[PDB]
# Entry
Amino acid sequence: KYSGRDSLIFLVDASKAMFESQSEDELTPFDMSIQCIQSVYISKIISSDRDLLAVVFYGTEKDKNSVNFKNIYVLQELDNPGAKRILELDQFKGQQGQKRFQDMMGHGSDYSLSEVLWVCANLFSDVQFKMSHKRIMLFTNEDNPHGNDSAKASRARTKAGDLRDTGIFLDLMHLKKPGGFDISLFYRDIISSKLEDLLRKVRAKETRKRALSRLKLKLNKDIVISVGIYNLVQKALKPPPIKLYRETNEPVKTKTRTFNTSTGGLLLPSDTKRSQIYGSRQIILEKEETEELKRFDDPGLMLMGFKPLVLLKKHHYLRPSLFVYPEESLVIGSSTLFSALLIKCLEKEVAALCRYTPRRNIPPYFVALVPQEEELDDQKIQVTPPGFQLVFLPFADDKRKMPFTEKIMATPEQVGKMKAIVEKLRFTYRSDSFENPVLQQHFRNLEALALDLMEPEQAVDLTLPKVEAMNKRLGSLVDEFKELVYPPDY
Amino acid sequence: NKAAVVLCMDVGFTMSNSIPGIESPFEQAKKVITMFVQRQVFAENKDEIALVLFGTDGTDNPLSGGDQYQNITVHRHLMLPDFDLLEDIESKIQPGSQQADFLDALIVSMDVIQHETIGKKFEKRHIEIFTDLSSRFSKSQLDIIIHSLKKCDISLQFFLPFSLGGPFRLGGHGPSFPLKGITEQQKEGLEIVKMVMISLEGEDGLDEIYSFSESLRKLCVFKKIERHSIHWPCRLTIGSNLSIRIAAYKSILQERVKKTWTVVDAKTLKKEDIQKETVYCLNDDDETEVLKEDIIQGFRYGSDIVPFSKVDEEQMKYKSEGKCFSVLGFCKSSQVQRRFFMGNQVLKVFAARDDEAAAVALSSLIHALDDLDMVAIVRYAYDKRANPQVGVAFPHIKHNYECLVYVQLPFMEDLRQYMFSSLKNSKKYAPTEAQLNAVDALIDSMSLAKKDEKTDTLEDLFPTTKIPNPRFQRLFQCLLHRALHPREPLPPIQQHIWNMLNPPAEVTTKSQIPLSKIKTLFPLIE
Amino acid sequence: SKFYGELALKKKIPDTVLEKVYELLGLLGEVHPSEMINNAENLFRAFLGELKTQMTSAVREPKLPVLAGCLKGLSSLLCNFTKSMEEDPQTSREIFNFVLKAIRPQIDLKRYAVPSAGLRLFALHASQFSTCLLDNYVSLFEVLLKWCAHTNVELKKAALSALESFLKQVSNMVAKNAEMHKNKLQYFMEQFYGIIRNVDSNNKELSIAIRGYGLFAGPCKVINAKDVDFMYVELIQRCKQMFLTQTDTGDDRVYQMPSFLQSVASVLLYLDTVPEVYTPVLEHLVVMQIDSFPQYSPKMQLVCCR
DNA sequence: GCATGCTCTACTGCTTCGATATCG
DNA sequence: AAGCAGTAGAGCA
DNA sequence: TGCTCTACTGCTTCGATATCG
DNA sequence: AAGCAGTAGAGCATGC
# Structure
């Protein structure tokens, strides 16, 4: 589903022991859980801001819900992330926050059972949108809540079977009571530890999958194939700057007009023409003629023969390259021809040339279509799309020219020294992780007025190089590498 | 700067010659010249054009004796061209020819440029020369005019007719001469202009000559007339202190027009009697129309809207301390792929000037870097207003120039990656072997590259890097027609446009029976 | 002033509210035309400019419902501010060319909204364009006689009204001129002959034939004064053995009397030298009409009394 | 045989979000 | 609407 | 008389504006 | 471009 969304219930344990400091003086797992919750909401307020969230504490003294069972108390309903809801969730830190929890509910009772899974299910059974993922991240520690009676455990695993009947997926975050894999108890016929990822690897992203265009390619005049033209380097920037009326915190929604032929009144857009002026002579047109003269072809792609992959140099480009793929929605069974043409293009290295008009009215541009094949292994490592890529070519006034009158020689001694320098400064390039300085400091600067913690967190620059960590990686060959064959000496 | 372009025009006797059975060359001549004039007027550049014409039945020349300077008409002078010259060139479709010579047009035009060059700066000049190379000429003076053309510091480009020595329309990625298109005057004139052009320039003189066929589909009408580019100086740094002063120029960019459509109301044919404005109107309710000093530039956050309009972000904005061209590092892996380039312009960091020991140091740098797949990851910015961007610096070792070419790169906010259903392991979408051989015959018989001459360097026609773009051309000719023909509807687009923009139909005739094989072999389409 | 300032802003309104604001600018001009006496000129221009920039264009499908809105808006505005051809034979024929393009069929599409608007435009107002209907009457009659057999309830009786107003408008104009329209009169009368002598089903072709026959029995008495006398004899001799003799008592063919009676009245108003043999047939006819009441329908139940 | 009671699915149109040409 | 370096006219001389 | 400022200036950068699928 | 609903030309069963 495209406009479908994903829910998330955060279940927090507070009966006896997770409120304990583990006889330590570093941190309590309760405030660790509240750290994780506040970080995932401060991430998904700008990353994926239409998911459905909820947070439920179980086991305490009071109970407020819609079914009125004991030891189950919620604070938030399934909704969008609300900045007011996180400004009321941030107060549960420190000793006074623990005291605030203790004097608004306390904790401790003969706590829940199957019934907290029941209130999760009836929390899911009410919201009328579309659902795709339904995960429960439970925050608990112990490995036998059925430490005295077997009917509790039997009805708990039967209730988990009935929740996996409709398939609601729960996978807890186990706390570090041994710091890892030692307490491997019988909490395994319910589900099918790592928290630094949730703490800081979700800073500012966006997620979407649309299509941007659904065109057709014509080979001769009668070979029509239906393709979709996706974009894969979105070139994002900041959300738009809304205008606001001053005091009452409201938008403006301004208007515009045109009038005043030195008589006053109001003129409609029906009496409007366009013009161009050269000195004295002005060529006058109507707007229909202005939009008419940019008409050269139908919307579509036009085949113009083939080419081998040797002349289209990577010096040539003008556009973020798109991606194209066949769909069996318009023309029935065209992926068969596409799979055959893909097979012979990857077997005979050939790449096509085409003429492009994407929208319903546009001057053409020449494109080249390059084949591409997937890569895979056992971990579902799907990293490259099977299909075609569109490189865009310039026409006439783009390739300018330099004055061209410069040529000097060199002498082969510096090749090995430069090899030593590049092998000192050698690294595999990346897989990700060169995040945006301006956007990162902007979203943290917005966060500073959002949650009013203290101040702008200075978002650390990453585009700069570590000058000392390449100074000491280099060494004292800098001055000889300057003046080994070229001394300035003023 | 400023240039003084000269044109030489022949509508002489053989230019009044008939067809071969297809079309006349005189209308091609007038189409080429009117193309040059509309581009060099509608470019709004600062330049002087002069035209000279021979092949009429009059005599307009300050020197004219007998047959020496006979029918040599200096119709035009070195002025800024306007609509008057194109009015004249769609008022000169008459053949109307008496003529004897075409060599002396060059020297009378060069002499009137000698008598014109007073005061202004003319660093460069070009003449485009349109003789017919088949009428009678004379062998009177050659050494003086060769030395004058070598010494005048003015470039020249000559224009042959459509032949050199199937359905040729104007030019369509096809043949020039039908079966044999030469006479004896064409033989002696072509070998004489070949020896003059060889002695003038040399090897580029083999291609310093153009017909009407492929000079229509190439911008070789523009050579040493425009200013080259704009110089960019900076200082490259590697590590702490490897500051080398480096010059750089821009390259291929998505070109755009430089004229604004102007709003004109009806009944006035004017602009200044139009006030176009916006009103700041708080609606929300029954309206209370507000002023501009109520405006908090509020932003969106989740489910609310927050202030910090203007001066707060002027305080806590982002800086990156001036211009910078640093090197992050290098990478020996060739894992920067072909599909992540993401740039609205590409750069050539080139050299410096003024006793370029710095540029021979960069020549040493790139003559080291060129041997292996080791690239550079440059951090670039322009000023404090500019934004920082990392990108690839490709090596480029060539004959005359040694370049490094810089392209931008994505950040890990611009990538997106989602799952696709692959097609190799299919249960319904398997193509069979007769259909495989059909598409193999398709990709055979629809090719464009051909190899020959026993050296196996590739010969490929249809270069979609020299073909001009149709958009500003069609806009310019539609402007000219609505300027002169005062109330007619807009014409159809011209046929030499589609002559430039059409494929060679012989590959379609080669693969027509494959297309029938596809239609009769493959399963259902629609 | 508010709903005239409202539509001159940027093109953002999704066209179906533009339909109702056009019709409101019309209806507001229909009722109370003593407040918009100085600003009823430019509403013509704001309807017409939208008509041009919606209709004359060689690109994009025409915005459909805005045309129906603007057309019935001009229908509401054409009363009380009539710019007829008697002082301006330019804007009138301009509006007529626009409405002829609106009724220009050229295609067999569906959801007949805009030619329905054009039909009732030509119906409810027709006398404003005197001089520019005397040459395209074959074309108008052809497209209307195609539209009256559309097998649609809401469009057929909207076509009939434009048809009858067209005949009633051409009648006075073919009367008041001098002797030049014998071809037009004979062409109309011979097409009415060829329609009254079809025998398959078409009751409506028969009725429109009788109605035009009656409306043209008026201006025939100009020079001849004999064809008038042959007329009404043709009428009774055709009418009597069509409902009074048989299909009189039990049938479905009694839905036709007001046509015959309106025609007989229209010839008898300006007839001279009465025959005085057929009035004992005329009496049996009209008493059969007064008897034949309760198997009727309103909007026919009122014109039977008419 | 003309004017009503009763179903009916394809067409079109508005909203939501995202992408690209534009004057300054 | 904002900045950055090139390129012909003043001011002390 | 040459250097040193100096208002302009082409030309570039995002930025709010407009169009559409 | 996705999607979301609701009108409406178009037929069937029925009365006077």
